[PDB]
Amino acid sequence: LAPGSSRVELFKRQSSKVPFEKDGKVTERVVHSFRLPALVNVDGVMVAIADARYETSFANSLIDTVAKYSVDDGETWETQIAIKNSRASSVSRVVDPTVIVKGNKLYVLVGSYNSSRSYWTSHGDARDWDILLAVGEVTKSTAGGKITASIKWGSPVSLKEFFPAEMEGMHTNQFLGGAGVAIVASNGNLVYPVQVTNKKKQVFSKIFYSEDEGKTWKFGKGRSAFGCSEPVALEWEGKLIINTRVDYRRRLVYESSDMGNTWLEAVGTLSRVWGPSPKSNQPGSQSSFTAVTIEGMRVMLFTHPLNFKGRWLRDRLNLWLTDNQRIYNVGQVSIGDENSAYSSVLYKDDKLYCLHEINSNEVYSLVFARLVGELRIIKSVLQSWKNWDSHLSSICTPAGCGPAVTTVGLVGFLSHSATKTEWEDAYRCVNASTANAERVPNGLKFAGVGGGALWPVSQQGQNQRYHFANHAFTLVASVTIHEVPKGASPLLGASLDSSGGKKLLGLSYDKRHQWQPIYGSTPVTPTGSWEMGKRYHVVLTMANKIGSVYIDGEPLEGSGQTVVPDERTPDISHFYVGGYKRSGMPTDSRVTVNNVLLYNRQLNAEEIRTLFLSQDLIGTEAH
Ligand SMILES: CC(=O)N[C@H]1[C@H]([C@H](O)[C@H](O)CO)O[C@@](O[C@H]2[C@@H](O)[C@@H](CO)O[C@@H](O[C@H]3[C@H](O)[C@@H](O)[C@@H](O)O[C@@H]3CO)[C@@H]2O)(C(=O)O)C[C@@H]1O
Numbered sequence: 010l011a012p013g014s015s016r017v018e019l020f021k022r023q024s025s026k027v028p029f030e031k032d033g034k035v036t037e038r039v040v041h042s043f044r045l046p047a048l049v050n051v052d053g054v055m056v057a058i059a060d061a062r063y064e065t066s067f068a069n070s071l072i073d074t075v076a077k078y079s080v081d082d083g084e085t086w087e088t089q090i091a092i093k094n095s096r097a098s099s100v101s102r103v104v105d106p107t108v109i110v111k112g113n114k115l116y117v118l119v120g121s122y123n124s125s126r127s128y129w130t131s132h133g134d135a136r137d138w139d140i141l142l143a144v145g146e147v148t149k150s151t152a153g154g155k156i157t158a159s160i161k162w163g164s165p166v167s168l169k170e171f172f173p174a175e176m177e178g179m180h181t182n183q184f185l186g187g188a189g190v191a192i193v194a195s196n197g198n199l200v201y202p203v204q205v206t207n208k209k210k211q212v213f214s215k216i217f218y219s220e221d222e223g224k225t226w227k228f229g230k231g232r233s234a235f236g237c238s239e240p241v242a243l244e245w246e247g248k249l250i251i252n253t254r255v256d257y258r259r260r261l262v263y264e265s266s267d268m269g270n271t272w273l274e275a276v277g278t279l280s281r282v283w284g285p286s287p288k289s290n291q292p293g294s295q296s297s298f299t300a301v302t303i304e305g306m307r308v309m310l311f312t313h314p315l316n317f318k319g320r321w322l323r324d325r326l327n328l329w330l331t332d333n334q335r336i337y338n339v340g341q342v343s344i345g346d347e348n349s350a351y352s353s354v355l356y357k358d359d360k361l362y363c364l365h366e367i368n369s370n371e372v373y374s375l376v377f378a379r380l381v382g383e384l385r386i387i388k389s390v391l392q393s394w395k396n397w398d399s400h401l402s403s404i405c406t407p408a409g410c411g412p413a414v415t416t417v418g419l420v421g422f423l424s425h426s427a428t429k430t431e432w433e434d435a436y437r438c439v440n441a442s443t444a445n446a447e448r449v450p451n452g453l454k455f456a457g458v459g460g461g462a463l464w465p466v467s468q469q470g471q472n473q474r475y476h477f478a479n480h481a482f483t484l485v486a487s488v489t490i491h492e493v494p495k496g497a498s499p500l501l502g503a504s505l506d507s508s509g510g511k512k513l514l515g516l517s518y519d520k521r522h523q524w525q526p527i528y529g530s531t532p533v534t535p536t537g538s539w540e541m542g543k544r545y546h547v548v549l550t551m552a553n554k555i556g557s558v559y560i561d562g563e564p565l566e567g568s569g570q571t572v573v574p575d576e577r578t579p580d581i582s583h584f585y586v587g588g589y590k591r592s593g594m595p596t597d598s599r600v601t602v603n604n605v606l607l608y609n610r611q612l613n614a615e616e617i618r619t620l621f622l623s624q625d626l627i628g629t630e631a632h
Contacts, residue, residue: 011382020375042066042373048353048364072102097123107186115145118186141165202240214240216269229269254293323350451628452603461588481552509589514556528570552611562621
């Protein structure tokens with residue numbers, strides 16, 4: 010928890026009681042575990058919805074949906090049962106509540122099971138299953154001098170009549186909400202991302218939405234890949250962004266502009282960025298994923314555990330901030346090495362909160378954290394993004410001012426700031442590591458075997474913010490060569506392996522004063538010419554499996570070659586700059602590199618020309 014932040018145990022395992030109703034009697038009953046947090050704001054009333062697992066944290070056991078609500082931002086709370094299960098057997102349960110706030114209403118979607126002790130995706134059919142929607146109406150009152158609220162929960166209604174028996178290529182089995190908090194779209198539709206099974210026991214995600222305040226429901230025609238569960242969605246620039254759990258794999262993220270009729274993997278931004286464990290080979294998790302406006306900027310907040318422990322332990326709940334370009338790790342929200350899987354982040358009245366799980370020995374509580382320090386960090390980072398974008402956008406570029414320098418898709422920028430071992434991203438998300446470097450205005454001067462800088466791509470590890478580069482990127486830099494090399498030496502490039510020896514796209518320079526652009530593993534043809542001590546502007550672009558190399562705004566002869574040779578998607582290890590930064594590679598690049606920009610798309614000709622013409626205006630030095 011960041012400085013100034015704090016928490017309390019709000020739903021306290023084996024301690025907190027809830028009003029358990031059975032056969033007309035209500036009794037305050039102790040709950041073993043509380044899971045499945047969903048924290049929302051209903052026009053001033055904070056509401057925390059969760060599972061109340063009465064007897065055990067085992068999934069297939071007696072569970073009702075509990076709600077705690079507060080009109081004083083979490084200082085005090087009232088408790089109720091929002092949805093009771095069928096009471097059919099000792100393991101009857103309403104499960105994985107998924108919440109949408111609209112007006113003064115809470116719409117809560119839960120699966121319902123009567124007697125199965127088996128995990129839901131193992132069921133061969135839906136004999137034990139129903140899908141229920143309950144609506145809580147929140148009413149406020151200023152009775153007695155102080156603010157009060159109450160929530161009246163309606164009886165649950167089954168939505169099973171809206172579930173078709175067939176979908177493309179399949180027979181349906183069951184579905185559940187994706188857990189946590191869903192949305193109202195800008196057109197008013199209630200939108201639940203749902204996880205669905207078929208009769209082959211495959212799981213996949215869909216959009217399940219209502220145009221009439223929840224009276225009827227429809228499925229979008231499209232779907233995610235099989236294997237995608239617990240989807241969580243937000244709306245961004247007219248599209249739904251659907252972020253999915255993939256057990257034992259990297260999280261897939263999709264975009265849909267048509268209420269789920271068509272799904273496109275978000276390969277250029279967020280898909281495959283987040284891994285469920287250090288080696289992305291462990292179970293995944295539910296994630297909070299919301300779009301909020303902080304100091305005038307629309308951004309997304311995302312949480313997921315790092316899960317160093319593995320299996321379902323899911324320690325180290327982390328918070329992430331992104332503007333759909335840059336992806337910043339705000340930090341760890343949970344404390345130390347506690348197990349802390351599911352979470353829900355709420356931004357209300359310019360204050361940030363998180364309701365999340367803590368698990369010791371499979372006994373779960375929900376803690377309620379005030380994210381004071383985290384909001385401070387977020388605001389600072391957003392200020393930096395806004396300030397650098399404004400700086401670049403406002404430069405009067407050379408002819409009357411010509412086209413503005415583009416900041417659309419600008420993800421990272423290495424310029425004047427550097428420490429002894431790192432070249433600092435102006436956007437504060439991903440620094441490059443360095444060796445044998447000396448600080449110069451707006452960049453670094455490198456020399457010697459092992460020299461250079463490494464801007465990690467897959468080397469970022471569990472969370473890969475630059476995964477987009479495997480699909481498209483532009484890498485831009487100003488360079489000056491100080492010594493004619495003995496053979497061919499590297500200057501800039503994207504490497505597929507850790508050494509730099511297997512390149513996707515790169516630029517080297519040689520002893521006959523020629524450039525050596527490298528297109529994948531294609532034979533290298535030297536071309537053009539450069540002069541020692543003269544500064545040049547370099548652009549590397551890749552999109553649609555084609556790589557190009559520009560020197561001083563102009564493509565080298567023969568550029569625009571295929572660099573992705575087959576069906577496999579590249580897995581770039583890193584960008585290398587000014588050398589390989591590998592003592593094991595015997596090359597000695599003696600060069601200065603300044604102002605390295607990374608974009609998540611292939612820049613157009615005008616944008617490249619503008620960067621070339623403005624290369625001496627973009628640096629961070631004076632600031
Ligand atoms: C309806 C439902 O079950 N929802 C829970 C989901 C799903 O089970 C999951 O997405 C698979 O469909 O996941 C959560 O529950 C898991 C949690 O209870 C852990 C606690 O250790 O156990 C997981 O089951 C494991 C079990 O631990 C293993 O020993 C072995 O039996 O495999 C099962 C695989 O299911 C539960 O899946 C979750 O926390 O991830 C929570 C939802 O309530």
